[PDB]
Symmetry: D2
Subunit: 447 residues, 4 copies
């Protein structure tokens, strides 16, 4: 494989860096897997990434909203036609309500087609066997057989990735992204929800807006379909470097993209300034997210922003606040002020999930719904008060009727958790609770 140009100087340097949360496995074998994946069809194409950069610039400048979400960890087992549908459906069903509430174009990103690699686990498990690190590295089975790290799982992940994107592209053009269809499903929610009497205000109001549209004779070019972009945490060195492709923009302008997804994002753990991922990200032309915890100082946030967005292109960087309901109001404002002052129009995104994960006195780990909302509530209160733009959210959900998060309209308590708990990692929002979340965030976008 020959060199690009002046990137090779930078690329070699980028490999040199340490990478946290890597898998331990055979190197000679993993290099073969990579050189296989160096020639496959990509999951996405450069023009679609450009389209997302342009749409993400509008989010950065107050003209659009960002809905990101899906499974915490995709599993090969769960990557099926019925499950993918339900995630797409709930993502869209939310997006119609946020579109109305925000009075702006919602951009739909998804945790899909790549979100396999997982860091959150401690380095070793009880019983002396390695713990689950995603179906791209090892199996969920609690046996030394399955938990052994396997480079071949990278090809299985690429397979399952291209399967899922092929399906969302089909599902979206085939009209599960029909606007009238989605709102008819949202009435079925509000009618059959316990706390739907609260939300029926906005339900009727969206109903009216749609009937008004048809009354004005508005030709349904844009109403039959959507665009669901895709994303995952760029965790794994060999997989993400294998998906590097070299596109040539208009007038022969050459660039370097990671086409494993439209948008890649960096996690809390692999966040070092002189580590692989932040240097990888700054080299690739994709839009980029970056998770940010309470331990962030505004000094560091400006440092990230300078490296990841070195040309002040609005929407290139998303900064994903995940801080807990209590510490969001306190920590965030200083970060924004410093970042905005430095001349960077980033997308401010709320992740009210990975802040509020607590062990539920029941074996299982959960998040309380009321606390999840309260982090977003505070995320807006900071933006309203400072006079900056709430760019988006980054929730974790599923389209199955599962009981993993407490509270909500359903009244899910400690005792309800073992009844159905299908998640490979962090606890996801119930279908009921995902829609319910959107309606509340809509109300916050209005006021």
């Amino acid at each position: 494989p020959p060199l690009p140009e002046g990137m090779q100087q930078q690329f070699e340097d980028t490999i040199s860096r340490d990478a946290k949360q890597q898998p331990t496995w055979d190197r000679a074998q993993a290099e073969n897997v990579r050189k296989i994946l160096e020639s496959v069809p990509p999951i996405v194409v450069a023009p679609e990434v450009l389209e997302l950069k342009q749409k993400l610039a509008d989010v950065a400048n107050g003209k659009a909203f960002l809905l990101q979400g899906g499974d915490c960890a995709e599993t090969f087992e769960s990557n099926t036609e019925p499950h993918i549908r339900a995630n797409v459906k709930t993502l869209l069903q939310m997006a119609v309500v946020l579109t109305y509430g925000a009075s702006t174009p919602v951009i739909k990103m998804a945790r899909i087609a790549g979100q396999y690699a997982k860091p959150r686990s401690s380095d070793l498990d009880g019983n002396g066997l390695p713990n689950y690190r995603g179906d791209i590295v090892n199996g969920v089975e609690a046996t030394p057989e399955a938990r052994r790290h396997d480079p071949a799982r990278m090809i299985r992940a690429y397979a399952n990735a291209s399967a899922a994107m092929n399906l969302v592209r089909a599902l979206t053009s085939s009209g599960t992204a029909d606007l009238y269809r989605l709102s008819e499903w949202n009435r079925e929610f509000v009618a059959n929800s316990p706390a739907g009497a609260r939300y029926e205000a906005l339900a009727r109001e969206i109903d009216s807006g749609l009937r008004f549209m048809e009354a004005c004779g508005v030709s349904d070019e844009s109403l039959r379909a959507a665009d669901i972009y895709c994303s995952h945490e760029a965790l794994l060195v060999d997989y993400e470097r294998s998906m590097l492709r070299l596109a040539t923009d208009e007038e022969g302008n050459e660039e370097l993209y990671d086409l494993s997804a439209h948008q890649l994002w960096i996690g809390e753990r692999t966040r070092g300034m002189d580590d692989f991922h932040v240097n990888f990200a700054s080299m690739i032309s994709n839009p980029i997210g970056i998770k940010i915890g309470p331990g962030i100082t505004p000094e560091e946030a400006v440092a990230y922003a300078d490296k990841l967005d070195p040309n002040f292109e609005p929407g290139r960087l998303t900064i994903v606040a995940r801080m807990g309901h209590d510490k969001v109001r306190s920590v965030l404002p200083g970060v924004i002020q410093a970042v905005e002052a430095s001349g960077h129009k980033v997308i401010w995104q709320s992740d009210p999930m990975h802040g509020n994960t607590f062990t539920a006195s029941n074996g299982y780990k959960t998040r309380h719904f009321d606390k999840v909302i309260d982090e977003v509530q505070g995320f807006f209160e900071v933006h309203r008060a400072l006079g900056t733009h709430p760019g988006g959210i980054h929730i974790e959900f599923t389209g199955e009727d599962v009981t993993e998060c407490l509270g909500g309209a359903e009244d899910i308590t400690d005792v309800d958790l073992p009844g159905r708990y299908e998640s490979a990692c962090d606890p996801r929002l119930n279908t009921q609770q995902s829609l319910e979340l959107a309606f509340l965030v809509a109300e916050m976008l209005r006021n």
Copy 2:
């Protein structure tokens, strides 16, 4: 002028009938005026009349609403670019609010381009001189000079008619019928109205529906312009018979239209079954209205419906209830039941104007706003209860800030009337009071 076909047998018979409310003037002179007008360009064309019949069929079958209105009597003096604009603007500004409220296509008919002839006056005035009978017959001046009946005023009316339609067609294609522009004017009303705090519920709600439209990327083909159809009372024999033209529909299918307007309507006074107008109307292929008072018996309403709609074409006949706020609930239901049972899908239209005209203990004649609303309120209460469709309304308004009707948000009382009173005949709704009327009728269409 040669004969059409089997129509000539019927046409001769139609002339034979007596016509009420005619002008007394020279016959030889008036026949020359007619034979001049027999060759001019028509005010409208057959294909547009067909378009209205098709759209009026949708009103008859519950799928659309009918907004009709404008000046009571157009005057040559008042037929000016600024006045016509303001009437068009308020007609459209209403139509956007009714469209939202009804959740259906509003069809916009106007009292314009022909509404000159006037019957309401008693046959002779005080002082022994003839009274005003519209600028198509005589002048407003109180002198035996001006009040003399003049056949030449028919050509002056045709001139002023083609002037006004030429302007609405231009105004509508030029973008005074822009949907975003109209609602921006409606916010200026609700902000600057006294009782706008009541209406700001629906104002924000329409605002949201429009921002939602732009958020969904909806291409503005249908949003920049409208269609304002035109109408007048077919009062005058010589003028309406001069505008008879013979069109040939698809596959050479020949028909006879009165192209003085898109839709002609019959008044309370010239309503006889064996009089000129009802026989004229049944011969012409235009859509047709018919005014109906408290003295109507359901027996007669079915007789009209049989003659005017002899082929059960839905939307061909409109039946215009004008009965007073008190007698609307009582008289109407029996008429609908009999008409619906006879197998006629007419358009049920409310005229809350020509029922409630009372002399205002001030010289001038007025209508009270609260009473006008209450006739429409009852018009809906009858339809809601019977389970039939409220097809439309037929208000009289102007786009000038005039004080002719009492009540409203403005608090217009007896003493306010002489301050500005520009109407040639019946008292019209203030700009403020026309918009205010629409918002209330919207609220009635929802519930």
Copy 3:
């Protein structure tokens, strides 16, 4: 009537100038006619004039073509629904063929709604009576009764003007401007033309382009209707000054328009630099044409261009070459070179009509078809060679099957002329010969 602003200084000065080709009539009476017409609805509105300026800028910059034409002189007698249709139809039927040939948007201007005033006649007739000077001044009858100059004919002209524009606006929205309909009529021409075997190349080719359009599933938003703008020679002082209106553009920017038409043009006779019309034209914000004969020197053409286009707004001025088939190649190139060099992007338009008018040894006056074509042929040869843009043409035609011009596919000779000759002034192209002209000009636009 109060003053505009700094225009009044200029307006007074503009009146002061002598005006050629005026009518002699009562001044006190003509001032009443003018003060009547000062308050009527205009024939057009400012936003439509702005739209034309923007579209005419595209013609000036090589991106569009200009089709102007219609009757030489409209007559009140001829201003009828059937005649107007046929002129509109042939104007559009031409425009589809020119659109294809030019591979650009054709802009459709018409000699309609105002083209009554006529200058071409000598000042006095034989028999001592005044000669015909258009239905806006006097009648066609050869009697001292009718030929007397009548200010009231200005109001009759305004009436007939608003009649005709009301009809074209209706005819155009009602779908006589349907693109598939027009080409089906053009096949009927080519099939039934004698020389149609020459033109059937381009006929099939346009047929293919339309079927291709429907094959590509192209939504028919733009295909059902057109925009026919309107024009006349601004000849008559009192009529054109009566139609002056004051519009306020975006952000309250005030301007002065003559809304008797969209585009006014100046004739050969009333062309003086310090005469009324050139000073009138430079004061009004309308787009402007100017007729130009062989006697023009490039020195003068630059002088006109400086006065009429004082801000170098492209498309504001059209320069209408009418020079004869022989003298077009010789006279024109020097005019273009000087005008282009001076920094003026005007529209170069060919008028192959008013150059080639000769008395036909038969009483009547005619133009030979082959000579008419040859002036356009040379008009293109000049532009092809110089490398400038042929902006448009300015033919005179009618949609009746009349025999006024010699030659063509029909083989019209001297003896054929009295069979049907309906023109009030210059000889117009036959329906057959108008379409035939377009096909040839299309072939010239390709090569």
Copy 4:
């Protein structure tokens, strides 16, 4: 896996049948591969198959054309982003020319995402090792190691299938299916082709039709993108039965689809009436093709049509004539007459490839371009003469500059073949020769 309903009775019976051209491999292993593939995301979805049935009905009824084609056998090695692009590009580049020529919607089907299984080889090779039977069964390497039959290759094929469809869906929405872009590439062909002077007639003509489109202001909703459907020969029992899914149409109407592709087709070898494939095909709701050789008798063609299209749904069956240039005119007409008479509106498709395969006196096997054209030439001559509709073609091509077929504009002779020959099986058309084929078939569609 539970039963559908009354299908299970029929499904069991369908398995019972013998299947020709199957692979010999471990059954227990191959059943695991199948039960894995029973739960994956499908390559396509039911609504898209319905869309194709509706579009294929229009082809059957003379309103549309069918362009099918691509690689003869896809190889995992060749299934790459650059190769897939070039095939898509040439498929579309052809489709624009056929769309114009046919004056109808071309429907674009592709040999992609599944076309791995191959029957054409004799049962055993020289050297005693098994011969190549497609990357879904074994490898191209000439070693007993690689040629061993491997059930795991079914999962590798599904992986590579979902990879490729994910890419065409992306490539098509991203604007490699832009109509103006494709024709700009077609001018580069005609300019740089040797025999392009023949084709420049239609090249300019398509250029004109596109400029005309932009001149008419036609909004580019439909012009930026296309729909490329997908197909392969349903050869392999375990793979096709694994992709059976159960969809529920509008109003809960249940059906059974094979979602390995949009359209499956049956080969010459596996064509028996009581064999697996014809009974499989008749059970699945997909549209269906069927290859047909010279040995077909009209008696049999009606028998097929009765079984495969048991409800006379037009466009459900495609009948693919592959007969050789000589025997096409002779054999075909009798088949059509009998089929049309039986009341079946099938799609008549020409496969001018698998008839004319001859060994090229050079080791390699080839087809002559002039002979390939002549089979289509005769295919049309039969339809023109009989007065039936030429529904489509089924060529085999690639977007690489390869030398596998003789003749064409390039002048490829025997000596040119080894220079570049990349095909795993039958010889494909050069990029130059694929475009050139389309232009000629366009000319045949006109006359």
